[PDB]
Design an enzyme around this catalytic site. Structure first.
Site, PDB file in Angstrom:
ATOM      1  N   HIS A  68       0.823  -1.232   0.000  1.00  0.00           N
ATOM      2  CA  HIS A  68       0.000   0.000   0.000  1.00  0.00           C
ATOM      3  C   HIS A  68       0.852   1.275   0.000  1.00  0.00           C
ATOM      4  CE1 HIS A  68      -3.248  -2.848   1.261  1.00  0.00           C
ATOM      5  NE2 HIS A  68      -3.939  -2.082   0.421  1.00  0.00           N
ATOM      6  N   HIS A  72       1.539   1.534  -5.735  1.00  0.00           N
ATOM      7  CA  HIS A  72       0.110   1.104  -5.799  1.00  0.00           C
ATOM      8  C   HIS A  72      -0.777   2.282  -6.203  1.00  0.00           C
ATOM      9  CE1 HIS A  72      -3.680  -0.817  -4.744  1.00  0.00           C
ATOM     10  NE2 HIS A  72      -3.919   0.107  -3.827  1.00  0.00           N
ATOM     11  N   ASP A 107      -5.273   5.649  -1.006  1.00  0.00           N
ATOM     12  CA  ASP A 107      -4.664   4.859   0.114  1.00  0.00           C
ATOM     13  C   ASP A 107      -3.702   5.759   0.917  1.00  0.00           C
ATOM     14  OD1 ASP A 107      -5.825   2.218   0.333  1.00  0.00           O
ATOM     15  OD2 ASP A 107      -4.503   1.438  -1.247  1.00  0.00           O
ATOM     16  N   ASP A 217      -8.421  -0.712  -8.124  1.00  0.00           N
ATOM     17  CA  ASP A 217      -7.749  -1.119  -6.882  1.00  0.00           C
ATOM     18  C   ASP A 217      -7.251  -2.557  -6.969  1.00  0.00           C
ATOM     19  OD1 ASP A 217      -6.756  -0.545  -4.441  1.00  0.00           O
ATOM     20  OD2 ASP A 217      -8.624  -0.934  -3.451  1.00  0.00           O
ATOM     21  N   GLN A 269      -5.380 -17.571  -3.367  1.00  0.00           N
ATOM     22  CA  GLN A 269      -5.537 -16.649  -4.531  1.00  0.00           C
ATOM     23  C   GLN A 269      -6.736 -17.094  -5.399  1.00  0.00           C
ATOM     24  OE1 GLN A 269      -3.562 -13.720  -5.512  1.00  0.00           O
ATOM     25  NE2 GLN A 269      -3.853 -13.985  -3.292  1.00  0.00           N
TER      26      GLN A 269
HETATM   27  C1  LIG Z   1      -4.767  -7.276  -5.820  1.00  0.00           C
HETATM   28  C2  LIG Z   1      -5.137  -8.217  -4.752  1.00  0.00           C
HETATM   29  N1  LIG Z   1      -5.837  -7.808  -3.633  1.00  0.00           N
HETATM   30  C3  LIG Z   1      -5.983  -8.882  -2.847  1.00  0.00           C
HETATM   31  C4  LIG Z   1      -6.604  -9.018  -1.548  1.00  0.00           C
HETATM   32  C5  LIG Z   1      -6.650 -10.341  -1.033  1.00  0.00           C
HETATM   33  C6  LIG Z   1      -6.063 -11.490  -1.695  1.00  0.00           C
HETATM   34  C7  LIG Z   1      -6.131 -12.854  -1.133  1.00  0.00           C
HETATM   35  C8  LIG Z   1      -6.224 -13.901  -0.530  1.00  0.00           C
HETATM   36  C9  LIG Z   1      -6.372 -15.093   0.240  1.00  0.00           C
HETATM   37  N2  LIG Z   1      -5.352 -15.860   0.639  1.00  0.00           N
HETATM   38  C10 LIG Z   1      -5.856 -16.842   1.397  1.00  0.00           C
HETATM   39  C11 LIG Z   1      -5.039 -17.866   2.037  1.00  0.00           C
HETATM   40  C12 LIG Z   1      -3.675 -17.900   1.821  1.00  0.00           C
HETATM   41  C13 LIG Z   1      -2.825 -18.861   2.457  1.00  0.00           C
HETATM   42  C14 LIG Z   1      -3.404 -19.794   3.322  1.00  0.00           C
HETATM   43  C15 LIG Z   1      -4.791 -19.769   3.528  1.00  0.00           C
HETATM   44  C16 LIG Z   1      -5.619 -18.790   2.905  1.00  0.00           C
HETATM   45  C17 LIG Z   1      -7.212 -16.659   1.515  1.00  0.00           C
HETATM   46  N3  LIG Z   1      -7.513 -15.579   0.727  1.00  0.00           N
HETATM   47  C18 LIG Z   1      -8.766 -14.968   0.468  1.00  0.00           C
HETATM   48  N4  LIG Z   1      -5.421 -11.334  -2.935  1.00  0.00           N
HETATM   49  N5  LIG Z   1      -5.411  -9.990  -3.456  1.00  0.00           N
HETATM   50  C19 LIG Z   1      -4.899  -9.600  -4.640  1.00  0.00           C
HETATM   51  C20 LIG Z   1      -4.265 -10.601  -5.546  1.00  0.00           C
HETATM   52  O1  LIG Z   1      -3.039 -10.998  -5.093  1.00  0.00           O
HETATM   53 MG   LIG Z   2      -7.381   0.930   0.614  1.00  0.00          MG
HETATM   54 ZN   LIG Z   3      -5.724   0.441  -2.736  1.00  0.00          ZN
END
Ligand SMILES: Cc1nc2ccc(C#Cc3nc(-c4ccccc4)cn3C)nn2c1CO
Ligand SMILES: [Mg+2]
Ligand SMILES: [Zn+2]
Length: 313
Positions: A68, A72, A107, A217, A269
């Site tokens: 952030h 970004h 941000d 974003d 992801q």
């Molecule tokens: C631009 C952008 N903005 C974001 C915000 C969040 C996320 C994510 C996520 C995620 N990781 C897990 C996880 C990871 C390891 C172990 C267990 C669970 C669960 N979730 C929902 N990606 N993102 C990207 C792409 O990168």
């Molecule tokens: Mg924000």
């Molecule tokens: Zn942002």
């Protein structure tokens, strides 16, 4: 007056595409942003001296956190630029003016922690702003910088145009709170499908600008695979620092924030692309057909994460 910003040829051409990466040369990011204002808005939208001074105060109020950060901000503005350049005639002069500024500011003074960690730590911002904690802070930082001497890039606007643009910027910045995104995209889904969606209805415009803000974003999921994959390392560097801080408060973090559960990143992801990114770019392409390259790139990156899970990288 007769002064155009120009970029080298590869940048001049590639900046017009949705998947452009602004590159690692920080000192070019201000010129890239001015370039986008001049082409998007015009060479006379802002007094150059005020705009330059505004950009440099905005830059100084981003922190050196892994994700952030200033990079970004300029990245999210470039995505907005691409959207506005591919949907020229759908947007007012005030909307063009306000939205690039909203993206650059969205941000401001982020600390690399979620609204949720601020509420649990009991940070003063969580008592001043009970919901969209950081996003109300970002808008408040924007108004602060705008009120510094020689920083009022909106000085030439009428009193009411001034109040209109600051209201566009406020709603745009609030809309980057992903907790608000789900309801907003559901409503836009239903309005589009029943044929009620109406761009003369200001409250409809608001929701559509909200969805663009979510799209800009999250635009890291729409880049070339190496950009998408390396940005994910920055995103998780913040989430895991927050997880560490949760454990320090005596709280088991969610798995997304627990560096002990690193192995499940690929699967996490995937969930994020299916729960958030794909729906977002689907509804945006429905409402704004020339934004389809964002949906197509997002789908190519989900396929790259599937490939990671299957051992193929
Ligand atoms: C631009 C952008 N903005 C974001 C915000 C969040 C996320 C994510 C996520 C995620 N990781 C897990 C996880 C990871 C390891 C172990 C267990 C669970 C669960 N979730 C929902 N990606 N993102 C990207 C792409 O990168
Ligand atoms: Mg924000
Ligand atoms: Zn942002």
């Amino acid at each position: 007056g007769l002064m155009q910003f120009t970029l080298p040829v590869r940048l001049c051409k590639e900046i017009e595409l949705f998947h452009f990466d602004i590159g690692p040369f920080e000192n070019m990011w201000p010129g890239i942003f001015v370039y986008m204002v001049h082409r998007s808005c015009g060479t006379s939208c802002f007094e150059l001296e005020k705009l330059c001074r505004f950009i440099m105060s905005v830059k100084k109020n981003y922190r050196r956190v892994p994700y952030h950060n200033w990079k970004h901000a300029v990245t999210v503005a470039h995505c907005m630029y691409a959207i506005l350049q591919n949907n020229h005639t759908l947007f007012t002069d005030l909307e063009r003016k306000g939205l690039l500024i909203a993206c650059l500011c969205h941000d401001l003074d982020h600390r690399g922690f979620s609204n949720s960690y601020l509420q649990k730590f009991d940070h003063p911002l969580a008592a001043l702003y009970s919901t969209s904690t950081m996003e109300q802070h970002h808008f408040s930082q924007t108004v602060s910088i705008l009120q510094l001497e020689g920083h009022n890039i909106f000085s030439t606007l009428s009193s009411s145009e001034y109040e209109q643009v600051l209201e566009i910027i406020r709603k745009a910045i609030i809309a980057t709170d992903l907790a608000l995104y789900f309801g907003n995209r559901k409503q836009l889904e239903e309005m589009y499908q029943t044929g009620s969606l109406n761009l003369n209805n200001q409250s409809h415009r608001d929701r559509v600008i909200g969805l663009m803000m979510t799209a800009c974003d999250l635009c890291s999921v729409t880049k070339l695979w190496p950009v998408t994959k390396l940005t994910a390392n920055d995103i998780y560097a913040e989430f895991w620092a927050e997880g560490d801080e949760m454990k320090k408060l005596g709280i088991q973090p969610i798995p997304m924030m627990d560096r002990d559960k690193k192995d499940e990143v690929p699967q996490g992801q995937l969930g994020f692309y299916n729960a958030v990114a794909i729906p977002c770019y689907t509804t945006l392409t429905q409402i704004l057909p020339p934004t389809e390259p964002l949906l197509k790139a997002c789908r190519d990156n989900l396929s790259q994460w599937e490939k990671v899970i299957r051992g193929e990288e």
